[PDB]
Chains A and B, each alone.
With several copies, the nearest count.
Chain A
Amino acid sequence: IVLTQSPASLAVSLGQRATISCRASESVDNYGISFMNWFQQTPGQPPKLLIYGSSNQGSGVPARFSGSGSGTDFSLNIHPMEEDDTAMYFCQQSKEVPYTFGGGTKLEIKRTVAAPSVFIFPPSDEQLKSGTASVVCLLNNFYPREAKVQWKVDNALQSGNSQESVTEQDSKDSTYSLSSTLTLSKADYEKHKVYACEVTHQGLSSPVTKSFNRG
């Protein structure tokens, strides 16, 4: 059985109803009862059982979490959603011998769309001595996570050469932080002058480009 987890990435403000839906390839109802399970995993922690069976709640589970559904269509609902509910949720089946987990949903707290803080980092001179040059693009305190970062070296697009990192949502700021690193050998790095990072995001009406000249 393959478990499909409709919407697997949602953002909801405090006190809002959140629904995560799971669908199964085959019926998971057996012996009258349902054998479907919902697990919660906070970052850095082992998954914890929220809902064993279709509706029954696990140990130490607040009443906010609720499970419903029948046959192959199931839903997890958290209406009084609050702070530490930011976690990854899984829908799992126990009807057949191969236990299968759903895709998983990262439930995140919503905040109004913000304009990214864009800045650029030229490679350090001591790095240039070692024959490598890494130029960094910094996006600070922007929402949502969806953003397009493009490197422009002398008005040329580069792909397959950049590494991307994104931090987790801030507990207080509730805005993402994003870092793009473009790495090159020294000989190719000095071969061009204008290095730019272009960012496209919802909080920007048009793409914003920050450029610098080497030296």
Chain B
Amino acid sequence: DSFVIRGDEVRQIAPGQTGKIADYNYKLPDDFTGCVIAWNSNNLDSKVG
């Protein structure tokens, strides 16, 4: 599952988390036998304005 999120809310991508993104956009199950990878993309996805 690939997407773009705000820098702060990466802490909400985890089992048993709460917040706008976790509880409304992308909710991750409690078990989640898997991995989460996040990296900065300010150079790629940010344009002037």
Q: What residues make up the interface of A, taking CB atoms closer than 8 Å to B?
A: 2, 25-26, 32, 62-63, 72
Contacts and interface: CB of A to CB of B under 8 A. Distances in A.
Nearest to A63: B49
Contact of A26 (B15, B48, B49): B15
Interface residues of B, number: 8
B10 interface: no
Interface of B: 14-18, 20, 48-49
Contacts, number: 15
Contact of B17 (A2, A32, A62, A63): A2
Interface of A is mostly: loop
14 contacts: A2-B16, A2-B17, A2-B18, A25-B14, A25-B15, A25-B16, A25-B17, A26-B14, A26-B15, A26-B16, A32-B20, A62-B49, A63-B48, A72-B16
| Residue of B15, B16, B17, B48 with most partner-chain A CB within 10 A | B16
A96 B17 CA distance: 16
Contacts of B49: 62-63
A102 to B, nearest CB: 15
